[PDB]
Design a protein around this ligand. Structure first.
Ligand code: 58U
Length: 352
């Protein structure tokens, strides 16, 4: 009794809402695939690949949103032939959101650097976004997702990264329903490495900014932080971008320039450590106060040479800690204040 070949697809005829996050495949049993074609509505063929043993065919390029595909396959065996025709329709998004992932590919960053995925649209289903984001670490370490706002989610370990750790971030959002008819416009894939442990502590009691590289004190900077009425917040800051020079505009951070606490200052050697506008930068005008008295709007004022030193030796992801000021604590959702959120609260997340 010779068997008739059987044709099994990873879709079914008449299917709709087929998600394009995965390839479409066809399998033969009691025979081999002699012919497999898939065309879109317009008759344009889709690239596919047949396995050497002739048993498995799969698409090999991206499938498009909002499309009607037609699949034709024929299987031959000693028992005879069999042909099937399947038509199906893929997801038809109401909205598309593009993801952006920091830090940059190939980059080497500090031990406080979180994984950041920012979407250009509000994410209705955060849980679906988190699931779609595949993070790999080496050596392996536990981490968790937490949302700073409706568009950006962060991933980080309980403690600072171990130097030498590889991080791989695969944002596989294409074809994924992120909620309310919003699907990922594309995928992104970044990889980066954890460099040396650089931790700079600013103690308001001593007015000193001590830089420690892998435990070792390598630089001690007299500093002037925020004057009482505009104090520098205590807490953990993540180093962000660095500038040879930059015009600091208080309106950029919510405070009108023409205000009592406003300002517009052109400074040298500026290292940003909070979205709220905290910078380590060159403050020549206050070199007398540094190490003695706080006089700034909130920045860590240091000498020109120490500012340039900081610029040259501190990198994105390195850590600045402020302690014992008269300020409060840096908001966990500052954008660079991730570490100020307790692990239990971060691990619990906020996907809802
Ligand atoms: C950063 O937030 C701005 C500052 O705190 C420094 C530039 C200090 C300052 O504004 C000043 O008046 O010297």
């Amino acid at each position: 009794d010779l068997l008739v070949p059987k044709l099994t697809a990873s879709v079914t005829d008449g299917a709709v809402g087929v998600t394009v996050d995965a390839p479409v495949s066809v399998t033969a049993a009691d025979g081999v695939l002699a012919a497999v074609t898939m065309v879109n509505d317009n008759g344009r063929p889709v690239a596919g690949r047949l396995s050497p043993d002739g048993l498995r065919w799969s698409t090999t390029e991206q499938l498009g949103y909002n499309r009607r595909y037609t699949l034709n396959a024929t299987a031959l065996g000693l028992g005879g032939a069999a042909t099937r025709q399947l038509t199906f329709q893929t997801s038809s998004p109401a909205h598309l959101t593009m993801p952006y992932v920091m830090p940059g590919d190939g980059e080497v960053v500090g031990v406080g650097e979180p994984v950041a995925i920012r979407f250009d649209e509000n994410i209705a289903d955060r849980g679906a976004a988190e699931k779609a984001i595949k993070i790999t670490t080496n050596p392996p370490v536990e981490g968790a997702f937490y949302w700073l706002n409706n568009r950006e989610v962060r991933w980080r370990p309980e403690h600072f990264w171990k130097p030498g750790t590889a991080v791989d971030v695969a944002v596989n959002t294409y074809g994924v329903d992120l909620g309310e008819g919003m699907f990922g416009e594309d995928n992104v894939q970044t990889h980066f490495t954890i460099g040396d442990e650089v931790i700079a502590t600013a103690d308001d009691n001593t007015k000193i900014l001590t830089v420690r590289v892998n435990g070792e004190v390598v630089k001690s900077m007299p500093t002037s932080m925020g004057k009482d009425s505009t104090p520098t917040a205590n807490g953990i800051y993540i180093v962000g971008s660095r500038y040879k020079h930059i015009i600091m505009d208080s309106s950029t951070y919510g405070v009108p320039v023409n205000s009592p606490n406003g300002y517009r200052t052109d400074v040298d050697w500026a290292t940003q450590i909070s979205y709220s506008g905290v910078f380590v930068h060159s403050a020549p005008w206050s070199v007398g106060a540094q190490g003695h008295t706080n006089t700034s709007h909130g920045c860590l004022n240091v000498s020109p040479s120490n500012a340039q030193w900081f610029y040259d030796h501190v990198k994105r992801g390195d850590i600045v800690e402020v302690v014992n000021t008269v300020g409060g604590t840096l908001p966990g959702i500052d954008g660079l204040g991730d570490w100020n959120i307790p692990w239990d609260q971060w691990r619990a997340g906020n996907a809802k």
